[PDB]
Ligand binder design. Structure first.
Ligand code: F6C
Ligand code: CLA
Ligand code: CLA
Ligand code: CLA
Ligand code: CLA
Ligand code: CLA
Ligand code: CLA
Ligand code: CLA
Ligand SMILES: CC1=C(/C=C/C(C)=C/C=C/C(C)=C/C=C/C=C(C)/C=C/C=C(C)/C=C/C2=C(C)CCCC2(C)C)C(C)(C)CCC1
Ligand SMILES: CC1=C(/C=C/C(C)=C/C=C/C(C)=C/C=C/C=C(C)/C=C/C=C(C)/C=C/C2=C(C)CCCC2(C)C)C(C)(C)CCC1
Ligand SMILES: CC1=C(C/C=C(\C)CCC[C@H](C)CCC[C@H](C)CCCC(C)C)C(=O)c2ccccc2C1=O
Ligand SMILES: [Ca+2]
Ligand SMILES: [Cl-]
Lengths: 742, 42, 115, 368, 80, 57
């Protein structure tokens, strides 16, 4: 018996090398820990959250510190179109001088990394102008991380650990998060936007030495108190306004122009300040709905338990749902896995929204012209979102294993979807099969037509519904005079009101065929959207099937007694490999990775063809699969794989090396994924024979060498597949874009 | 031009010593400390 | 240690990044032997620290019949670690000193010092 | 034709050699009798197989570091911009002096010596002269440098790990330290449950399964070595004077020593003729190139997934069928564990070999 | 050690006991089925977890379940 | 503190053999560590060119 891990007596008795690996992958599962009460669980999670926020603040502080010490922020604000932002400096002692020269730009005296995270554009759009500003922000975030660390340590002290009834307070928390984490924080961000960001955008310097001096508006808090609020939307920035300079400047602080600043090709800062103000007011209002200890307010529990039956006082949009939502509040509030899998689904939808919105409506100055930054940011957030959506269903399964109560949830919506789960799974299966057969067969027909010298015989189906939705927003690209495309329509004019003051600015941007806001779509878009539909449907099939069959199926009726992750149930009953619910999240990680590959491949090729000017490359080349293979993967690889050749090294040498590194890790995954445990256990037995019988080999394993377990090697191979899949595509996307468009 | 590693930034002698410490001087002590922590007996 | 630190200097002297020049090659080989010695002896020390806790498990248990592993006590292992460290650092710097003075050792073994 | 014949006979040989181990394991489980053969060579091999297998494990590791990790060394040194530190013919040279000496003995033997009867060398690959027919090179000396040392040690490594995988299943087909009664379980059985840590793929059949992949990985590198070396250092176009312009231009000696040069100067560069073949007469090769990629990727569905997922999804599909009263008497069951393994292996091999076939044949039918 | 549980749907066919490679299981008198026998698992410290006993069980669902638990040197099947 | 009845936890070398082994070890280790620091300071020009990658030309 070792003393490690201290959270599990059964792993301390483990005499093998399995306990080291199982103590690393069961360390944060506090529920299944020795002597864990619910209160102690919540308190530990609270302190862990504080340490996590400290890590986030330390990370942001380090980014700020390395741009302020080793970047070129002050040199880049002078020309943010012809200067590459610098992340930090290289100190690899193993470089030859040919790599030291390759990673040194024209305006630098040391090897550096080019920044592709977009923080230069973000910091330039919010007022930060000097390295001293960046250093001050970094030191503030260092101290704020220290504050979060002290808070986390403090709430582990006996007089300061919150009670369980405090953690169960779902009415006070929603009020304080809606009004005070989303409202007051957004109100403070509007305050910064009108005090620092918009002034510094016009050329005036506002700091913590003259902000009490400088008023944000010529009539300081005169229009707001008097009630004439339209004065703040008067004299905006003119079209010929040059960012960070006063030429073309205005005086307005809250205006609603719509569209983009024509010089930075980004959203207007007056629009973003007005946005965050109208968001702050609505969220501060919304954080006044539930009662805490002042009598007024709602009770969430009484609202949910009131959706039981029929009638207008009952759940009338689905009266045949039995007990309706009775027990759903307690399923949410008592189960931390229900909350986590619910919040992960919400966050994974919001992260995809972030990715889908920040390329179409760029919010930062000159970030639409940083092509590699735009591509990296979209791909980053879409992969983060796919992982969050995968973990949403993971913890939906873990809730149904660990916290689901079939009697507290008797005949409600949750127990009503668990009843007919075969209908849900078979209909996801039907949608998946239909989409897959049709999309693959259309692509293969197009391949066989183009290969046999008939590109004209391809089946090219236009996305007429999405082209029409492009038209209902005011796109005149097609011959569809729909709602906002029709200039004297009920939607365009706002007949009684005539207050859509967003319409001319928004139609200046959607009709502008040079931004990414509602890109033109054709036949090659319809097929890849159906492929994305297939991918999301099959990933949902795997995850929904494994969550709904988590508690048991016909092949293993008592699957809830074996846990969430377990290898199998042996080779009986035909064999039960990958039968656990954890293995569904395992099997759907491949499909998430494949779907996000399709998504990001589509986005990247669409934009590479747009940015090069040769949009017909993607147009008449994405309808068949060899065009994807040859005009995207083969073609935009020539600069990456020539990062180092027998003639020299350019600055793409690390991207070529990481491309090969990701290929290596992805291949190593297949070793854990195809070869299984007994092969390696017999190999390790021969190795144990060899070691005990060799002279001069005085070491001996304290813990017995065993092969990695079944679930362990599934996780190890999946982690390898993921890491190599991310590394290969991250190296290709940064180098295929940063070389064509330096 | 660049015959060796340089720093055109403040306290550019700090990578020179920080990269050895973080990457090949302090790691094997940390590995030894963690190994002694996971192999200590009750 | 003497035998080990002696030969561990050579691979980096011939094959290392400093191999284009004699003085730097011998220094790179010396510090490679020094680093490998200190790492190996830190491993010997932590093997003895982790293994000999109560009655050890495996070949260093009191009931073990392994003839090929005769250092049964932790005192043997600590004395071994200290000896391997001393001998290996000394053998490494003896090989380094013979390689630094290779011009002199060469003129000696050719009788060029008898003029 | 030369490419196709060499490649075809290497694949047939590798498959036949894997079947040899397959039937050496079937002999063990079924036809081996301990009472018949007592203290003979067959009994004495089974009676020290831990020594055989552990020494094969060590030699596979030694060969894997001293072939492939040297390629990784070369990649890192070439990306650093220090090619004097590489294992090249211009960096740290690794000349195969024994094979070079055999080549010299072969060209000295045939003099007007040790073989006075022969006029020419037994092949011009050893030495001698250049035979060019119709302008194109029939045969010329195959120079062996550092790249050839490195790729021959790749070959030794891959053959040895194939032997490890196959011999391990043959030697432990009867029993092991884990499962002492493995011969009672059969030659083709999936596992012996999740106990003893999990005894997945302990049968001899599963070792034939895992050695099929290793024979693929071994023979693919042999046919790649042949294709690139013959295409850059033998095959070409002799002019009137006699100057030989090789097909890829003698780039094996400097590009085939890194993994990046294998991916760029062999795979990316020489697949120009198979992906740019649409609309031509070689378009079937481009179609089969993509088809092989499909079948390779489709194999991974059977190789990475397990049987219980599919049996539990068939439950929902059977429910949807029972509701329409389209129930069938033959009850639909998922593929068994070893059958899912066999299907995955067959698909991987088929797609991955059809890909190389299309790549070789489109390339050689376009640039001659 | 693993946990081997025997339920009252047992019919005393002995097939789980005959299939056990490590002798965990034996038959005890029951008078709860007409065979008069039910399986028992006293030497469950010996259980490796192969689930041969579960493969040998004819009842639907199984009258014997193995729950893989804390791994010891015996349940990992280690001769080293 | 080195009397047999002493309870000092902070002075655990109770025997003279411990003290002589300690003296020999401190001498060996300290003379070696001193000449290791001396050798790193003598070759500071080389150790500097190494840690700047100036040896990869
Ligand atoms: C110390 C202890 C010990 C000892 C003594 O003492 C030993 C020894 C042996 C002998 C006898 C042999 C031969 C040698 C050679 O050649 O090869 C090398 C390798 C190595 C690894 C080498 C080793 C060496 C040592 C480790 C040294 C040390 C170093 C330092 C100390 C470190 C530092 C520390 C810090 C803290 C970090 C062996 C081997 C084998 N291994 Mg074996 N080891 C061991 C450990 C380990 C671990 C952990 C693992 C896991 C990874 C394994 C694994 C393995 C495998 C797979 C195999 C094979 O293959 C082989 C064989 O079988 O044959 C046949 N194994 N090995
Ligand atoms: C292929 C998808 C993809 C892409 C294009 C990016 C892109 C980016 N990420 Mg990343 N990331 C991803 C997936 C992706 N991410 C996933 C799935 C995770 C969850 C683990 C992360 C977690 C993550 C963190 C913690 C951070 C980023 C950061 C960044 C930004 C700077 C790095 C860079 O310039 O380019 C290079 C992109 C690569 C993918 C290079 C390959 C390096 C391999 C993948 C290392 C393997 C580690 C692991 C698998 C993921 C690491 C990603 C990240 C460190 C680059 C950049 C916009 C940094 C940032 O936010 O800047 C301020 C940052 O700190 N990401
Ligand atoms: C998490 C943010 C972060 C990241 C990813 C980096 C990364 C890096 N730093 Mg840096 N650093 C940071 C924060 C960060 N730093 C902060 C806030 C400071 C101000 C004190 C510094 C001060 C600093 C100096 C003086 C140097 C570096 C250097 C480096 C580079 C080499 C590694 C090194 O020597 O570490 C050195 C680290 C320190 C001296 C202090 C680090 C303090 C941070 C906050 C620790 C963060 C811990 C993290 C949150 C916990 C994660 C847990 C785990 C799961 C990973 C590397 C790119 C070197 C360089 O510039 O290369 C050319 C260099 O010498 N950093
Ligand atoms: C006004 C009072 C207030 C405030 C500000 C907070 C704030 C917080 N609480 Mg708390 N709480 C409160 C009252 C409050 N609470 C009360 C009264 C109770 C008792 C019922 C609780 C009980 C409680 C518990 C049990 C927990 C928290 C937690 C948290 C943290 C979670 C959110 C987070 O991590 O940061 C970030 C979130 C935001 C910044 C807003 C997110 C909005 C979206 C998702 C992002 C914004 C979108 C926008 C596009 C962003 C662009 C920025 C980009 C450009 C950089 C957070 C700092 C958790 C914690 O402990 O952390 C330590 C937690 O476990 N609270
Ligand atoms: C807010 C986010 C969040 C939180 C708090 C949790 C929390 C938890 N999850 Mg989880 N989950 C999430 C999101 C989250 N998850 C997402 C986004 C996914 C999909 C990927 C999952 C899928 C998932 C599964 C399938 C399981 C959990 C489990 C758990 C529990 C234990 C985790 C653990 O074992 O400790 C620590 C584990 C580790 C420290 C492992 C780290 C290794 C990871 C996998 C990869 C590391 C990257 C790699 C090193 C990069 C190197 C590259 C480069 C250097 C080359 C814990 C309560 C487990 C559970 O509840 O048991 C019933 C469980 O089985 N989660
Ligand atoms: C190219 C590789 C490939 C292909 C074609 C498939 C195809 C499929 N997968 Mg799979 N998968 C793969 C790789 C692949 N997968 C990998 C690497 C993993 C990780 C282990 C998975 C894990 C996985 C899971 C867990 C599931 C699937 C499912 C499915 C099926 C549903 C999608 C669909 O119906 O489309 C249509 C059908 C096709 C495209 C098949 C091709 C039809 C051929 C070409 C007809 C012509 C044949 C003739 C001889 C010529 C489908 C047959 C899901 C399912 O079964 O849904 C019901 C399911 O749950 N996959
Ligand atoms: C590229 C992917 C990849 C890699 C690297 C490996 C590697 C290995 N395989 Mg494997 N395999 C793979 C794919 C891969 N396989 C696939 C896809 C399958 C599917 C069927 C298999 C099936 C398989 C079987 C059945 C067997 C192996 C065996 C082996 C081992 C061979 C021994 C050896 O070469 O020693 C050398 C090690 C390497 C070449 C690994 C890379 C080492 C790098 C180059 C050096 C790293 C430097 C340094 C240590 C890094 C330290 C950094 C620090 C921070 C950690 C080896 C570790 C055999 C074995 O066990 O042999 C004894 C075995 O029988 N494999
Ligand atoms: C070591 C390998 C070796 C090999 C494979 C051969 C092979 C051969 N030798 Mg030979 N030979 C050798 C060493 C070798 N020799 C040595 C060391 C000498 C002494 C110098 C000779 C002297 C010799 C003579 C005189 C002749 C051969 C001949 C031959 C060829 C006829 C086959 C045969 O003898 O029956 C055959 C290809 C005969 C030949 O050349 O075929 C006409 C023949 O005339 N050998
Ligand atoms: C098996 C065998 C073999 C091999 C062997 C070998 C392997 C070898 C070797 C070797 C070696 C490997 C040797 C060595 C050595 C050494 C020495 C000789 C040392 C030394 C040293 C010294 C003298 C040091 C000193 C010092 C000190 C300690 C302190 C201070 C410093 C000084 C420097 C002074 C053969 C086959 C051949 C045969 C026989 C058997
Ligand atoms: C308390 C503490 C601290 C401090 C620390 C310190 C105080 C430090 C240090 C340090 C040190 C002070 C270190 C050292 C070292 C050392 C070494 C590393 C050594 C060596 C050596 C050698 C290797 C030698 C060798 C030799 C011999 C022996 C013989 C012959 C000669 C020769 C040379 C070869 C802080 C606050 C920071 C934090 C943590 C805790
Ligand atoms: C997809 C998959 C399945 C499901 C595959 C099945 C069930 C086989 C698919 C073959 C189909 C069902 C063909 C049979 C249909 C009839 C023969 C009718 C065909 C129509 C013709 C007569 C025209 C597994 O069973 C399996 C098992 C173990 C590991 C991996 C996997 C795996 O990946
Ligand atoms: Ca050098
Ligand atoms: Cl190269």
């Amino acid at each position: 018996a070792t003393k490690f891990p201290k959270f599990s007596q059964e792993l301390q008795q483990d005499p093998t090398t399995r306990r080291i690996f199982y103590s690393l992958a069961t360390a944060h599962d506090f529920e299944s820990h020795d002597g864990m009460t619910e209160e102690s669980l919540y308190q530990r999670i609270f302190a862990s959250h504080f340490g996590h926020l400290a890590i986030i603040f330390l990370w942001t502080s380090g980014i700020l510190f390395h741009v302020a010490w080793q970047g070129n922020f002050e040199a880049w604000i002078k020309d943010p179109l012809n200067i590459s932002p610098i992340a930090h400096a290289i100190w690899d002692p193993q470089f030859g001088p040919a790599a030291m020269d390759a990673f040194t730009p024209a305006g630098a005296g040391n090897p550096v990394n080019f920044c592709y995270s977009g923080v230069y554009h973000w910091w330039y759009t919010i007022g930060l102008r000097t390295n001293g500003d960046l250093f001050a922000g970094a030191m503030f975030l260092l101290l704020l991380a220290a504050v979060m660390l002290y808070a986390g340590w403090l709430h582990l002290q006996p007089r300061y650990r919150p009670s369980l009834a405090w953690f169960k307070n779902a009415e006070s928390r929603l009020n304080h998060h809606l009004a005070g984490l989303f409202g007051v924080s957004s109100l403070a961000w509007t305050g910064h936007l009108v005090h620092v960001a918009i002034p510094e955008s016009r050329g005036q310097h506002v700091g913590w030495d003259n902000f009490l001096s400088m008023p944000p508006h010529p009539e300081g808090l005169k229009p707001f108190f008097t009630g004439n609020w339209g004065a703040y939307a008067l004299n905006p920035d003119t079209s010929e306004h040059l960012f960070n300079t006063s030429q073309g400047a205005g005086t307005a602080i809250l205006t609603f122009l719509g569209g983009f600043h024509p010089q930075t090709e980004s959203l207007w800062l007056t629009d973003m300040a007005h946005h965050h103000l109208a968001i702050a007011v609505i969220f501060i209002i919304a954080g006044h709905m539930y009662r805490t200890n002042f009598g007024i307010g709602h009770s969430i529990k009484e609202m949910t338990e009131s959706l039981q039956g029929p009638g207008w006082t009952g759940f009338f949009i689905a009266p045949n749902t039995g007990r309706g939502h009775k027990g759903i509040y307690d399923a949410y509030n008592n189960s931390l896995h229900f909350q986590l899998g619910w919040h992960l689904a919400c966050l994974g939808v919001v992260t995809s929204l972030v990715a889908q919105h920040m390329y179409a409506m760029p919010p930062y100055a000159f970030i639409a012209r940083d092509y590699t930054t735009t591509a990296a940011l979209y791909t980053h957030h879409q992969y983060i979102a796919g992982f969050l959506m995968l973990g949403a269903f993971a913890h939906g399964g873990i809730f149904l294993i660990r916290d689901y109560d079939p009697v507290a949830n008797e005949n409600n919506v949750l127990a009503r979807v668990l009843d007919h789960k075969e209908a849900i799974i078979s209909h996801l299966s039907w949608v998946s099969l239909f989409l897959g057969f049709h999309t693959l067969a259309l692509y293969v027909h197009n391949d066989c037509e183009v290969a046999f010298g008939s590109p004209d015989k391809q089946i090219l189906v236009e996305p007429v519904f999405a082209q029409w939705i492009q038209a209902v927003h005011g796109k005149a690209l097609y011959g569809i005079s729909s709602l906002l495309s029709n200039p004297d329509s009920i939607a365009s004019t706002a007949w009684p009101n005539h207050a859509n003051v967003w319409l001319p600015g928004w139609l200046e941007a959607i009709n502008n065929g040079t931004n990414s806001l509602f890109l033109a779509i054709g036949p090659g878009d319809f097929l890849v959207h159906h492929a994305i539909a297939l991918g999301l449907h099959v990933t949902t099939l795997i995850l929904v099937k494994g969550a709904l069959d988590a508690r048991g199926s016909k092949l293993m009726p008592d699957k809830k007694d074996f846990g969430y992750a377990f290898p199998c149930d042996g080779p009986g009953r035909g064999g039960t490999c990958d039968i656990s619910a954890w293995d569904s999240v395992y099997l759907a990680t491949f499909w998430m990775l494949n779907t996000l590959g399709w998504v990001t491949f589509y986005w990247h090729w669409k934009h590479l063809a747009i940015w090069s000017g040769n949009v017909a490359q993607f147009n008449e080349g994405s309808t068949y699969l060899m065009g994807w293979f040859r005009d995207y993967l083969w073609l935009n690889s020539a600069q990456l794989i020539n990062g180092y050749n027998p003639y020299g090294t350019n600055n793409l040498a690390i991207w070529a090396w990481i491309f090969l590194f990701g290929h290596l890790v992805w291949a190593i995954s297949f070793m854990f994924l195809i070869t299984w445990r007994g092969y390696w256990q017999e190999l390790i037995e021969t190795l144990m024979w060899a070691h005990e019988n060799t002279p001069l080999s005085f070491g001996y394993p304290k813990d017995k060498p065993v092969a990695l377990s079944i679930v362990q090697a599934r996780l190890v191979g999946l982690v390898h597949f993921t890491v190599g899949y991310i590394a290969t595509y991250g190296a290709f996307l940064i180098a295929s874009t940063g070389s064509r468009f330096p | 031009d660049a015959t060796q590693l340089e720093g055109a930034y403040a306290a550019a002698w700090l990578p020179w010593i920080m990269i050895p410490m973080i990457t090949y001087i302090l790691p094997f002590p940390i590995f030894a400390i963690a190994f002694l922590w996971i192999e200590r007996e009750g | 240690g003497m035998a080990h630190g002696y030969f561990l200097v050579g691979p980096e002297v011939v094959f290392g990044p400093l191999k284009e020049g004699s003085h730097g090659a011998n220094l790179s080989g010396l510090i490679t032997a020094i680093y490998i010695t200190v790492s190996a002896c830190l491993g010997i020390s932590i093997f003895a620290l982790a293994t000999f806790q109560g009655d050890p498990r495996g070949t260093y248990n009191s009931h073990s019949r392994d003839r090929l592993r005769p250092l049964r006590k932790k005192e043997d292992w600590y004395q071994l670690s200290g000896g391997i460290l001393m001998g290996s650092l000394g053998g490494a710097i003896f090989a380094y000193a013979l390689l630094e003075n290779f011009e002199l050792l060469d003129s000696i073994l050719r009788g060029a010092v008898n003029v | 034709t030369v490419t196709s014949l060499f490649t075809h006979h290497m694949w047939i040989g590798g498959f036949l050699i894997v079947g040899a181990a397959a039937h050496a394991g079937i002999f063990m489980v079924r036809d081996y009798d301990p009472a018949e053969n007592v203290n003979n060579v067959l009994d004495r091999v089974l009676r020290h197989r831990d020594a055989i297998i552990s020494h094969l494990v060590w030699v596979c590791q030694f060969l894997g570091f001293h072939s492939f990790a040297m390629y990784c060394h070369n990649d890192t040194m070439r990306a650093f911009g220090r090619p004097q530190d590489m294992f090249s013919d211009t960096g740290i040279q690794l000349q195969p002096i024994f094979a070079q000496w055999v080549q010299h003995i072969q060209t000295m033997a045939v003099g007007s010596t040790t073989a006075p009867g022969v006029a020419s060398p037994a092949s011009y690959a050893f030495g001698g002269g250049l035979v060019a027919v119709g302008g194109k090179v029939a045969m010329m000396p195959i120079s062996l440098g550092t790249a050839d040392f490195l790729i021959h040690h790749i070959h030794a490594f891959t053959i040895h790990v194939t032997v490890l995988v196959l011999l391990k299943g043959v030697l432990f087909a009867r029993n092991s330290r884990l499962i002492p009664d493995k011969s009672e379980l059969g030659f083709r059985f999936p596992c012996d449950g999740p106990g003893r840590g999990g005894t997945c793929q302990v049968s001899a059949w599963d070792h034939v399964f895992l050695g099929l992949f290793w024979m693929y990985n071994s023979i693919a590198m042999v046919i790649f070595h042949f294709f690139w070396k013959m295409q850059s250092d033998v095959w070409g176009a002799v002019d009137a004077n006699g100057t030989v312009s090789h097909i890829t231009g003698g780039n094996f000696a400097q590009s085939s020593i890194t993994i990046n040069g294998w991916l760029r100067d062999f795979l990316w560069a020489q697949a120009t003729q198979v992906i740019s073949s649409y609309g031509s007469a070689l378009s079937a090769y481009g179609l089969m190139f993509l088809a092989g990629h499909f079948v390779f990727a489709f194999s991974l569905m059977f190789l990475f997934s397990g049987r219980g997922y599919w049996q539990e999804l068939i439950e929902s599909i059977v429910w949807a069928h029972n509701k329409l009263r389209i129930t069938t008497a033959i009850q639909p069951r998922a593929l068994s564990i070893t059958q899912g393994r066999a299907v995955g292996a067959a698909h991987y091999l088929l797609g991955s070999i059809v890909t190389t076939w299309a790549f070789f044949l489109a390339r050689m039918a376009a640039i001659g | 050690s693993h946990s081997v549980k025997i339920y009252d749907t047992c019919i005393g066919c002995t097939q789980c006991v005959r299939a056990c490679p490590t002798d965990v299981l034996e038959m005890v008198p029951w008078d709860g089925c007409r065979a008069g026998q039910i399986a028992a698992s006293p030497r469950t410290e010996d259980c490796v977890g192969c689930k041969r006993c579960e493969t040998a069980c004819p009842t639907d669902f199984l009258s014997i379940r193995v729950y893989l638990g804390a791994e010891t040197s015996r349940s990992m099947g280690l001769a080293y």
